[PDB]
Design a protein around this ligand. Structure first.
Ligand SMILES: CC(=O)N[C@H]1[C@H](O[C@@H]2[C@H](O[C@]3(C(=O)O)C[C@H](O)[C@@H](NC(C)=O)[C@H]([C@H](O)[C@H](O)CO)O3)[C@@H](O)[C@H](O[C@H]3[C@H](O)[C@@H](O)[C@H](O)O[C@@H]3CO)O[C@@H]2CO)O[C@H](CO)[C@H](O)[C@@H]1O[C@@H]1O[C@H](CO)[C@H](O)[C@H](O)[C@H]1O
Ligand SMILES: CC(=O)N[C@H]1[C@H](O[C@@H]2[C@H](O[C@]3(C(=O)O)C[C@H](O)[C@@H](NC(C)=O)[C@H]([C@H](O)[C@H](O)CO)O3)[C@@H](O)[C@H](O[C@H]3[C@H](O)[C@@H](O)[C@H](O)O[C@@H]3CO)O[C@@H]2CO)O[C@H](CO)[C@H](O)[C@@H]1O[C@@H]1O[C@H](CO)[C@H](O)[C@H](O)[C@H]1O
Ligand SMILES: CC(=O)N[C@H]1[C@H](O[C@@H]2[C@H](O[C@]3(C(=O)O)C[C@H](O)[C@@H](NC(C)=O)[C@H]([C@H](O)[C@H](O)CO)O3)[C@@H](O)[C@H](O)O[C@@H]2CO)O[C@H](CO)[C@H](O)[C@@H]1O[C@@H]1O[C@H](CO)[C@H](O)[C@H](O)[C@H]1O
Ligand SMILES: [K+]
Ligand SMILES: [K+]
Ligand SMILES: [K+]
Ligand SMILES: [K+]
Ligand SMILES: [K+]
Lengths: 258, 257, 258, 257, 256
């Protein structure tokens, strides 16, 4: 692709607006947005998480107005986590901080991640423990070895399916993803406080150092997200991941290529 | 609205200055600014908070000089009023340890403010969809399990005080094009309040095209939540504590077609 | 006051340099810089703090070279807390963190505040608890009602006296103070660590958005400050506010007005 | 070297892309990326760590297209690879409390990376000069009590993998003119890892005169440490956990005399 | 009167060095550490031993002999040996059963200054009845006002292992010919956060474009880097400090 000039005129821009729901595990029909309570294996080698205990990456492929050579170029993004105030419910069967106290709020390990691309997000597999048995119905690094704990280049995949790719197994592949922009923060530790900002006044520019944004192959925009906000502690002490949805607004323009 | 030129001249600007009081629940005649002590339900399905235990969004609709021209909100100065009150650690609080001072207000906070030319638009999200919200509050109706992540049926306008519980509602990011909003949720039982005050900081309300909120019907809409944390009494029971918020907004007349 | 031009020439500038001592309560002749140990009332209605338990705002009214219409205009400020390293004394009958350990350092709730104006700082009263009986010798919000716990516009005052205005009752009135610049941070929580920066290389500009600094009425510059650094914990577990002095260096120039 | 002009033309730029794996100790065939469990000596003077308990600096020498012209390193993109693996809180860790999830990796971290046109230069500093460092490591020799603060005899090059323990060595600030290095030590047993990833951030490697590292013998030297914290097992024993680091470096041809 | 800067190959020079910490050095094996910290039985009987008190470090660096004066223009600085704080195996106190040792942490003071004369100090005492030990230089004739501000307590940082950190700060009412920077982070569990890089420069010029001017052709460097406290197995605690690197660039300036 030689990238040429931007088209102008009223017809030359379009806008995508949507939300991606979190996929935390959904252990029963009342617990959308939550994982199954977390249990711990008896040995390192016997690590064997249930499917409904593993948060996954979310993805949406959004069709754009048909063009044909012109391509849609993603230029700007507004994004935010939806429902941050729900985490103020400290009265719904949680564990009291101390005698007569309110319930403990959602807190601890979080991963907040989003990406915008002109093709599927490309993933690299990395395992905390290569002998972890990942459950049926997930897509996980295959033929794991001890090198998979640091870097095994065999573990390549595309984020091309929902409720499938566990967060703990996969990261954006920094050796690829030239046609995607991705942003993520892992904040680890059992007592980490959620710090969630909302505003409709902040815009991220998606242009690279040459002034070119993601170019949407086949007229599809790919949006991906994870928002594991922390863990909810129930009265018994058992803990569940809690996630929230993410809003995306992307502005695109037509770009000629050869 | 096609937005055209700004009017100039001595008559062409105006200023709104006010404060919004917090609405934390007010459980009795001595406890303005506090919620009821928080109690925990023994199951998810039996979650059933009392009205006076739920902080709500504050809102004021401010009439502007009668005026096609519209008032355009350009700048905002804002701050939380009474930050130093949180230094009262001698008033029936739980000692930090034997012979120690009382615990200050701390833990989960939500600080939020918006300025718009129409009512703030809200989207409902529920921690627990089976929570029974109390009479006298306006809350997401026909909740389902999807309401725990995103149910698009839950749309509302922040059009009334002491009504919209903070925990149920957020600004709808899919709308609000004629409002500017800003908020931070800081969660965790031991989070320290960090409250800055100064009269030297201004927030510009103009969008990327140089246009601020345009006030429909000559009304400016101001909204706020300032849940500062929880106060722990000697018994250990805990109450939300909130504070008032100052707003100063400058506006100018804008022609539209 | 229409503000007109700045005077130039060697005679046209002046400098104020000084320090404000903290007023933490001073419970006896050995405890300048400390409050009385803090006690807790059994009920809200019986809250009744002793004077020497209440830190107060510090203020100085500094006379300037006499002018008369010209007025001194405050243009820049350098400021810092004096004696930050004294908080490293962890050997002076404090409470040991653990068996054989050093003493707990000053920590917990802090308020750091300073203002420069051409008249007395204007205050608004806000009470944690409206039924608090404030002690003789202090100046506190009068005719308190339950609305005083959020905003009662009857509680207006000027910071016009030392050892008088308790920190916990009063804040700068944001509805006034047009001829003052003020800056403050409240950091609450029993374990918050003091973070105190010192340098002689930082300058704050005091000019407003029109290029005009505070104009000194009657040729007086008003400086105000609070630096409650935290609490010192004694071996017994009793706690006392600890404060430190604040340095001010202000540069001024002569300004004509009509 | 007098540095002269940059060569232009299609042939005049090149790109290096790779990853450096961490060297945390690798106590057995299943534990790449981990150290041996940490033990505490009975006395200060008997401090005597095993080799597989000591994380080491990673280094790669990368050959460049054979070229007086030299390759000049101009920009760097870098990130830690596999940050989300630290969400595994179910793999025989120590529960935070009764029925709770396992404690995540946390505590003391060192995140460090450098790009140079020759080996990173090191200075030795010891916590405890009487520490007996183990065979198979390269450590400061002829240690004295001054080695606890600054002993200028302890100079070395990062010229070998699994050799130079992190706790003994730092970049020598008195040298390294032809290298750019960046590091952060965050100490304390409960420190939370804060790991950012993005493909949109670039670090410029040019010094104040507009000159990047010049690659002697057509080799680029990359170095890294990413000790993320400690994993706590169910027994309470603790092991350092590290992750790999991505590097992408852009270079251009520079004439020198 | 400050006049023009000299140019030419001969007109610039560079100082590079390190200042070692002075934490107390309680014996011949414990350079970089203080004595274990003890707590007095009463407030009035506070009485620290010398080897328990960290002190300011200072170096006076001679410059090429030169009216012209050397003007300090830029500074690169960093703490040397940050990684040594990863030693969690050296008879420390275990965080929990079978755990590693607790790392250095808690109260820290990180401070550095560059000047054309000795750093000027002001004395402030936590407790005016503290008896400071022989061999230190401390505020004399202390009164209760010394707990907040007693202007009698002026000194120059003109000697090593002498001026205790807890007694003295840079005097903000003087030091016009010095640039100083410091951060106190207090609290028993504060985590050390130490950044290293060779890519960061601090400009030393004031608002008029003039850096410190070196009187008698001497450059004065000062530092404190109390990183926290090391906890031994017994629970006893000792300050731990590290050295600090300085690289200062200077140019010749004419004055009248
Ligand atoms: C609890 C214990 O015995 N620890 C010693 C350890 O023993 C090994 C296994 O324990 C763990 C552990 O808790 O340390 C189990 C963890 O799941 C492993 N974690 C990971 C991520 O792999 C760790 C890890 O492999 C090592 O710590 C790496 O150094 O080991 C223990 O369960 C196992 O017990 C066997 C038993 O030996 C066998 O005869 C019996 O039939 O079955 C049991 C269960 O399979 O034995 C393992 C050793 O083969 O071994 C290390 C030495 O490698 C230590 O001796 C460790 O004790 C700690 O040692 C530290 C210094 O290394 C320090 O002194 C701590 O204070 C000690 O607790
Ligand atoms: C446990 C004890 O006795 N502590 C007192 C100490 O004794 C010295 C040795 O103790 C340690 C310690 O304090 O834990 C051991 C550490 O590994 C050392 N750490 C380092 C980095 O060197 C520290 C350190 O050197 C000092 O704290 C420096 O101030 O010391 C102790 O093991 C040793 O025991 C000897 C014993 O004396 C001898 O009769 C017997 O034959 O053999 C034993 C094993 O060798 O003795 C050491 C003293 O020579 O000494 C210090 C001061 O010198 C204190 O007395 C310390 O008690 C603390 O004192 C503090 C004030 O100084 C404060 O009051 C605390 O409350 C006390 O616990
Ligand atoms: C232990 C005791 O009786 N405390 C009284 C106090 O008595 C003081 C002396 O106690 C101390 C202390 O509180 O621990 C000793 C300490 O080193 C001093 N520290 C400093 C830096 O000066 C403090 C300090 O002077 C005061 O707290 C200032 O208010 O005092 C004691 O050792 C001596 O025998 O007697 C002294 C009295 O002359 O007096 C206080 C009133 O001034 C209190 O009555 C205190 O009692 C405690 O008060 C706490 C809060 O007020 C708390 O509620 C405890 O329950 C209560 O025992
Ligand atoms: K690539
Ligand atoms: K929209
Ligand atoms: K006003
Ligand atoms: K050098
Ligand atoms: K001065």
């Amino acid at each position: 692709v030689e990238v040429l000039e931007v088209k102008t005129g009223v017809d030359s821009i379009t806008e995508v607006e949507c939300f991606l729901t979190p996929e935390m595990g959904d252990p029963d029909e009342h617990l959308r947005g939550f994982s199954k309570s977390i249990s711990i294996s008896d040995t390192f080698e016997s690590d064997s998480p249930n499917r409904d205990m593993l948060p996954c990456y979310s993805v949406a492929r959004i069709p754009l107005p048909n063009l044909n050579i012109l391509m849609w170029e993603a230029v700007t993004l507004k994004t935010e986590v939806i429902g941050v105030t729900s985490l103020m419910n400290v009265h719904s069967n949680g564990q009291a901080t101390h005698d007569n106290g309110a319930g403990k709020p959602v807190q601890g390990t979080s991963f907040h991640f989003f990406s915008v691309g002109g093709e599927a997000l490309e993933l690299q597999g990395v395992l905390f423990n290569y002998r972890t048995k990942y459950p049926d119905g997930t897509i996980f690094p295959k033929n794991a070895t001890v090198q998979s704990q640091v870097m095994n280049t065999e573990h390549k995949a595309y984020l091309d399916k929902n409720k499938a790719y566990p967060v703990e197994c996969w990261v954006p592949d920094p050796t690829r993803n030239e046609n995607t922009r991705y942003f993520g923060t892992l904040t680890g530790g059992e007592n980490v406080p959620p710090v969630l900002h909302i505003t409709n006044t902040a815009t991220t520019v998606l242009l690279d150092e040459f002034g070119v944004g993601p170019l949407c192959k086949g007229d599809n925009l790919y949006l991906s997200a994870v928002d594991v906000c922390g863990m909810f502690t129930n009265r018994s002490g058992s803990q569940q991941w809690r996630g929230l949805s993410r809003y995306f607004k992307v502005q695109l323009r037509k770009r000629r290529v050869k």
